[PDB]
């Protein structure tokens, strides 16, 4: 029951490719929405909770989780070659699978193996997106070593 | 009996139970919500409140007071690879409750001894403090 | 000897066991105190006897229409006196209420705050100020340092 | 054992709150009193919120007179009932304005032998005692005090 | 130009003399209303002038204080004043003298000044003056007891 | 018989008005005359005032209104209220400081008592908004032969 | 291909460029608001979303994509003595766009050494922690005359 | 072309007007002769002062507005107001510090009194906004 392609090359996805993702997730009341956004690849990859219930106009919070949900799966099975030089998204996903769902995050700052030792608590959260505090600390404690 | 699987519960299962505890006066909101068995579990008071209309404190009270039974006796083998729900009932029967909110955040038995205060509070949703500190020294004790 | 418990002033029945009171209770209990006005009111919200012992001032004025602080603190006065003088077997195993009423009697009314977090006499030791007021519900700051000082000198070996 | 002199407000009934409002020419709020069930206990422990709020008394100055009137009775009353250590009389030989604490003092369960482990933040928030001046007063000479 | 005018025990007519003399009797009526008496005279607001008396204008305020400063500094305070802290403050500074009434209200005296801290002699005594505080205070701490 | 510098603590509401007319704000004239402000209000005049009980609401006018008090309260003759002659101290520090007088006269500052005076209450009591001045001041206050 | 002079841009090639990366709906505001080089390379969320009505937290976010690549590819040199550009270039090419943020503070590779964090984000607008964390240590390695 | 040390601190309200012409910012003569701004305003105008009381809602068009007074200050001649040539030592330093010699004298500020000045003082009184600028401003002024 898992959407398909698996596997996806999410950060050059277009358009209608986040489209096909919104129908198989059961989330077409929203196709609209992401349509007139012009939603890509980048920024469902990006998407932040302000941008989903101002910008996209999912008023629930409820929703919204479900949302998230469904994201957080995405981005944990992506494939981030194009854009993770270093394959940071192994390095995450050697810590606990889950982790591999930040991959584009730290990228996105331009982060990679050779720097993460430096990257601060704040970095992580403000910068690169992990809001969940046990993931942030895990994540700091392993970079720190390397 | 055999405890339910409440986090493969799907919408159904759900509204089931809501009728079961009587408030059959939501189930049009948690129907329209969609609201599964990771949701319920998941549920805060902010999205019982604006999202599924429950108004009263006093009703979302008693709403939680039955939440929290059947977190109690709820099966997490699905979710729960290294039983933390037997720790947590070990410590206090009580304690079961905070099952999922630890599996959520990819805790497990391993782990558990790096957690810190904010992150039971924050991340994991364990509210009270009483149980966030004894939770909290029994980890730093396994160890 | 001053017991004014066998007086025709305190409702009755004295010393219930409102941690398993239902809603007619309840119902009862606002009629001696001389709040049949809000009986309504706490019917609809369902309270029973755990949610009573639980109740809040944002519940009160929001949830049960007691606009008035001067009525909610009639109505506080009341509910601490039913506190003082419940029944708390079924949820005290460890006696937390006689510990607080050899304190003072007036501390017993704090004995379903203590059991609701999940408070024991072994675990009173380790009990902080923060969580006597926020888990524990415990306002007076006198009471709080009081019940502290008292934890903190007791025998866990 | 017909009239007292000191008057023991802490028993006092609704009537007889009612009588006072009377006697200090404060008749126009007998109604709201009334309604809002005051009694001896409720008028002790009275504060600006609930008289501004729920007994309409809108005036800042109006307020300032009644607790003029207030503070008198307060400072007069028999707290016999309620006060077993005698705070009124320790209240009373520091500044005999004092006394218009007891109420504050014995209603959080503090008595003479308690008073030394009282801080300024209890006798403020706790026992409403605004006057710092008062405070800080009452909190020197609780330092010379024997605990147990 | 009253000569040593008993203004703690004034009652609301005197009260009324004194706004007509000072050209205030635009405000006769907001002081009668709301039985404005010698007591609640020297201990009147900046706030309770505002907003229970009606005066608006700031400016209007600063005449009226003006006035009510000069009524303290030849006040006579002797049924509330029984150490005659008027005379010492006077002393000091003639100036000073109008503060007699918010010290002797909270129950100070010549014996018990020196134990008061600046934060009292705002919030308690009613001393808006950094300046005058600090004067009252220094004299204070250097005076003669028994 | 005209004098240089002007008495403007001893200025009458009608001298205040005069003045008004000279430097162009004739359109105040009434506001000042129902407000009564004569030349202790106008030496004491702060923002607030002038905006809300005076109705002037432009910032640039207030602001063009300061720069003409400014200029007068640095040559006004104040010689009734200031027996010690802090203004040619303040003038021999710099002939703008002239401008503070009546801000430290009429908190009861004189030379002698100047060496005590402190940073807050230059700000709060006697309305030196410019920390440059505060400082100058401040220093050459504590350097003074007591 | 040219880097185009974008310091020197006149309200008609900030027009032309947003047609380019279709934008075209936003060039009246633009037009108004008389957005030139200098302007453009200055702007802020808060001028997008207030002054030229961009509305969207999402349409922002891909008008600075556009923004970011503009930046990252412009001739600098009128306003770049020192060539700031390369320096930043160097270390990462993705810091290239943050040259008119450094030379519009009066920055240049002389005294970039002294540079604070707070004036990294405050004065020259550079938003992500990383980003300044790593331009700030380059800098404190650099010549220190 | 573009005008040679112009007296802007005695600037008088039509020089103002004048000014806003060349500029481009004509829309807004009308504000600033209702508001009666002159050299002395007009050197110490504020964001505030420009959107609410001369009626510039647009951060964008204050930012022009600012940057075309930025210019204004740059080549203005001080002299009436600047006894010690602040305005050289300023512009030693850089030719873009230039701006802020208004703020300075308008303090009483000169050479004498720079090297004693505080960061907070150059912020809230002189009116140096930028980090960069104070921290230079600072240094050079210790070490003469």
Known sequence: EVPRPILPSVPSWKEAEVQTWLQQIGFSKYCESFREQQVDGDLLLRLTEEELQTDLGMKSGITRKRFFRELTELKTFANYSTCDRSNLADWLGSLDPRFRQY???????????????????????????????????????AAREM
């Open 103 to 141: 991959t584009y995050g730290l990228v996105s700052c331009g982060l990679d193996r050779s720097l993460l030792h430096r990257v601060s608590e704040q970095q992580l959260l403000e910068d690169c997106g992990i809001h969940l505090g046990v993931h942030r600390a895990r994540i700091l404690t």
